[PDB]
Each structure stands twice: as structure tokens, then as C-alpha cells.
């Protein structure tokens, strides 16, 4: 039940885990010379970039339908990791995602926490439309399912969370690395994920590798006055490597 994960100068503790999941059974590791493409020495900032970064908390209420964040986008503003991300053409990283949500023994609810590779979102409308860059790059704020009028909507992604935002049934989302946070049992979910791509390193600004999706499968219910509780996400890059240094991209 007790976890303690130490990353840089950061340590996470959780007295109520469903022990951690290692996506696809592979622990993150630095890129091997046998798989490498680019020929310059990759810079490895170590503890200055491989540490836990806590994002802006979201509120879980009885009418919440879901949220998603994309990596590495969510960390583009995070200290040394964010800096390296934009000073270099190529980057590569694994992550430890720790989703935290505590309540009480008098609260009930269940979240599905999934990490999806190449989560190519569907657009909201019909016709010849596609999702605009800005909308799949919300930053640490992430995206929350709101079912109610946004803009240049021919550029917006779909809000059909029950179709995994991409035309497949929620429900089968379990085929992806995931954990459930069932309030009567745990107060956190931890997923360790390696780098997954069809190329050894890639552009972090242009390609998001993982999408983190959180969906309340069973609603938050309680008789307590504290009837909304936050969900906080802390993500730690792991084995971050960068290559192709030049000016910082704006």
C-alpha cells in the first residue's frame, strides 16, 4: 500500500497505492547507440530535468466527465526540462506519472487513468475539418470535457469522452497502460512509462507521444459537505536526452 518514489530532489509518498504499473513492461532507459540516428552527443541534464513537476490541479465534481493532457506538451513550461525542449531540435524522455486524489471512507467514486500512445484525437465536426495545433497543445492546463460552445469550432477536437475522443469505445481503453483510482481503495495511481515511438528521438514541439486521459467511470458521491475534491498530477521526466542545440524556439 505504501510507495515512496524519489526522482531528482523530489520524493513522492502514497500510503494507499494499487502498486505502480510499468507501461509495456519496459523500464525507461537512455537511447542506445545501436538504435541511434542523429550523430551528435545528446545532452543529459539529469537531476535538473528528471524530477517531479506538479501541474495545476483540477476539480472533480459530480458533473465531471473527463480530462486529458498530452506529453511532452504539459511540461513545456517546466523548468530546465521545458528549456531543453525548445533549445533543441530533438528530445527523448520516459516519465513517472503520479495522479493523486484523496477523499474519505464516506466518499465513493472511480477514475480510469490511462496513458495512450499516439492518441490522435478526432475533430468535433463533420466535413473536411482537422484539429488545430493550439487545441492539442493546452499546456499544463490540459483539456476538460465541457459540452458547450468554443471557437473556430472547425478546429476543435471532439468532446465524446466515452468514445475515447477518437472513435473507439471507452471500456476498451483498458488495452492501454492504465490504473483505476477507486476511492474506497486507493488515493493515487502511478504509471512509469518508457519512450515509445517509431523513431529514436523526435521533435517535442511537433509530436506528442503520450496522452494522459482521466475519466470518472463512477461519479463522485458523498454526504459530506466536502463534495468536490481535486485531482493533482505530478509528472517526472526520466532519462531525458536532447540533441541538435541551437536558439530557443518561440
Amino acid at each position: 500500500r505504501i510507495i515512496q518514489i524519489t526522482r531528482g530532489d523530489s520524493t513522492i509518498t502514497s500510503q494507499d497505492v494499487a502498486n505502480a504499473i510499468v507501461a509495456y513492461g519496459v523500464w525507461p532507459h537512455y537511447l542506445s547507440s545501436k538504435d541511434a540516428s542523429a550523430i551528435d552527443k545528446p545532452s543529459q541534464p539529469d537531476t535538473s530535468s528528471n524530477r517531479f513537476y506538479t501541474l495545476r490541479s483540477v476539480t472533480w465534481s459530480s458533473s465531471s466527465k473527463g480530462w486529458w493532457w498530452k506529453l511532452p506538451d504539459a511540461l513545456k513550461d517546466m523548468g530546465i526540462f521545458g528549456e531543453n525542449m525548445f533549445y533543441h531540435y530533438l528530445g527523448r524522455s520516459g516519465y513517472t506519472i503520479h495522479v493523486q486524489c484523496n477523499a474519505s471512507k464516506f466518499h465513493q467514486g472511480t477514475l480510469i487513468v490511462a496513458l495512450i500512445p499516439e492518441h490522435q484525437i478526432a475533430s468535433a465536426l463533420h466535413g473536411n475539418v482537422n484539429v488545430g495545433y493550439n487545441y492539442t497543445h493546452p499546456g499544463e492546463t490540459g483539456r476538460e470535457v465541457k459540452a458547450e460552445t468554443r471557437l473556430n469550432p472547425d478546429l476543435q477536437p471532439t468532446e465524446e469522452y466515452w468514445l475515447n475522443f477518437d472513435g473507439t469505445l471507452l471500456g476498451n481503453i483498458t488495452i492501454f497502460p492504465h490504473q483505476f483510482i477507486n476511492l474506497r481503495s486507493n488515493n493515487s495511481a502511478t504509471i512509469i512509462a518508457p519512450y515509445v515511438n517509431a523513431v529514436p528521438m523526435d521533435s517535442m514541439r511537433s509530436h506528442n507521444n503520450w496522452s494522459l486521459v482521466i475519466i470518472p467511470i463512477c461519479p463522485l458521491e458523498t454526504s459530506s459537505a466536502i463534495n468536490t475534491i481535486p485531482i493533482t498530477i505530478s509528472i517526472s521526466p526520466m532519462c531525458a536526452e536532447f540533441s541538435g542545440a541551437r536558439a530557443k524556439r518561440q
Partner: protein, 269 residues
């Protein structure tokens, strides 16, 4: 590839409950028949070969239907076709490959050319199919110089000939094909696999010189994957496809319709 045998099982009275677990962990249960019931010893004899990726994806399916309507008026000006190659335009094949995030395989292409007679006779018809990789000049007319095929690969079919067929090796500049791509252009445009999956075009022309018989030639293209590998399984597509390279599913003035069928009451199966 063998399925394990069902072993004999007895009545247990114990402190360890194999049936009891926590799915919050994101792990699938390990309970087998012997843990929950007093099981009989059965010697199962099933191979799992047919369920392999090679078997599943290694079947020829249609990926394109190329229609060439021969015009006799501007014989050299037209009478050729161009198609940007992809596996996104026909549902049966597309859905099978999209069960994975990344795939890698060699391709077998079989052509089924059918001449539709619109005149009294069909004469002698010969077709040329040329593979034009990105960057090579694309033909602009039936008599374009590009049809010389000095270095591109062309294949010829004439009425009476068996179905043409040839293999292509894994074509990507990456280590695997992207069945999905959460990314963009270097210009922040074209979200999706349109960026990653540029395999060039398949162009065709009727080679026979001007003649007097109107005909239409429909060449269906079949694709079979060979020596297959795939990574990161995904849930199967639950709705009709609407566009190539996009996961969009919304149709105008039409509600979302999945394959789930409703029932009146959940206490009756």
C-alpha cells in the same frame, strides 16, 4: 502454438482466495478454471497459429478501385490515373491494421484488371502501372515522357494475361509505419498520419495507341502483408470511417451509432 491443458482440481478450504484481487492495479486477473470450480482433467489440443499476426494480416484485401474511362476524343491528353497510395480508404483492411499503433511488414500487391466493353468488341488492350515515389515526375497525360520508366518500376498487363502481382519491401524512412500520429507539419498543420505516411503514387495508362472501341477499365488493387510485426494494441474502431488519415467520426445530420444493441431490461439476457 499450444493452448495449456485443463488440470484436475479438488475441493479447497483455505486462507488464500485466488478469486479475490484488486483491478485498481491495472493488472488482469490470473484465475483459471481450477481455482473457482472442481475441475475435470481435459487434454486440450489447439494450435494458436491462425491467431498470429502473420495469419490475421497476411490475407489479401481490396485497398483501391481504380477506374479508367477511356476517352477517344482526347486520346493522349487524358486516359491515365493517379492515386496517392495508402491503406485508409477501404474499411475492412484499415480496421485490421489500426488494431495496432505501429506496424512493420513487406507488401504483396495483386492487381485485378477488368475491361468493361462499351462497344461491339474490345480489341487488344494493354495497361501500364507505374510506381512513382515522392519527388519523381508525375505523368500529366497518356503520352507523358515519364512513362518511359527509365528507373521507376512499371508493370504491364494485357488482355488475356493472368493477374499481375509483385512485392514491395517495408517502405518507411522510420522503423515502422505509423497507424496513428499525434503530431503535425513543420508548419503546425495537417494533424495526423498525413505527415508520416507519404508513399508516393500509383499511376496507370492504357498503353494501346488510339483505337475505335469505348471501354472502361477497372483495376482493383489487393494488398497482403508479409513478415509482419506490430506494437501497442488499440481498441477496435467502433464507428464508420469518414476520412482518410483522420479519426473523425461525426457525420452530418446523423447520430452517433455504435454496434452496441440496446435491450429493455438488464435482468433478461
Amino acid at each position: 502454438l499450444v493452448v495449456p491443458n485443463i488440470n484436475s482440481s479438488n475441493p479447497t478450504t483455505s486462507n488464500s482466495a485466488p478469486a479475490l484481487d484488486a483491478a485498481e492495479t491495472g493488472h488482469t486477473s490470473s484465475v483459471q478454471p481450477e481455482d473457482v470450480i472442481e475441475t475435470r482433467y481435459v487434454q486440450t489440443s489447439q494450435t494458436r497459429d491462425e491467431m498470429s499476426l502473420e495469419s490475421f494480416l497476411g490475407r489479401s484485401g481490396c485497398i483501391h478501385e481504380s477506374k479508367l474511362e477511356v476517352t477517344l476524343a482526347n486520346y493522349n491528353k487524358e486516359n491515365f490515373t493517379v492515386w496517392a497510395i495508402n491503406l485508409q480508404e477501404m474499411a475492412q483492411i484499415r480496421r485490421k491494421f489500426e488494431l495496432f499503433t505501429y506496424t512493420r511488414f513487406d507488401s504483396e500487391i495483386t492487381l485485378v484488371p477488368c475491361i468493361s466493353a462499351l462497344s461491339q468488341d474490345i480489341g487488344h488492350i494493354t495497361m501500364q502501372y507505374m510506381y512513382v515515389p515522392p519527388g519523381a515526375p508525375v505523368p500529366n497525360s497518356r503520352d507523358d515522357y515519364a512513362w518511359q520508366s527509365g528507373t521507376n518500376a512499371s508493370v504491364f498487363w494485357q488482355h488475356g494475361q493472368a493477374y499481375p502481382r509483385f512485392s514491395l519491401p517495408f517502405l518507411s524512412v522510420a522503423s515502422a509505419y505509423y497507424m496513428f500520429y499525434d503530431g503535425y507539419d513543420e508548419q503546425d498543420q495537417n494533424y495526423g498520419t498525413a505527415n508520416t505516411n507519404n508513399m508516393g503514387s500509383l499511376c496507370s495508362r492504357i498503353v494501346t495507341e488510339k483505337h475505335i472501341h469505348k471501354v472502361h477499365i477497372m483495376t482493383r488493387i489487393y494488398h497482403k502483408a508479409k513478415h509482419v510485426k506490430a506494437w501497442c494494441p488499440r481498441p477496435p474502431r467502433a464507428l464508420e470511417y469518414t476520412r482518410a488519415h483522420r479519426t473523425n467520426f461525426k457525420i452530418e445530420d446523423r447520430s452517433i451509432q455504435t454496434a452496441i444493441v440496446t435491450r429493455p431490461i438488464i435482468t433478461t439476457a
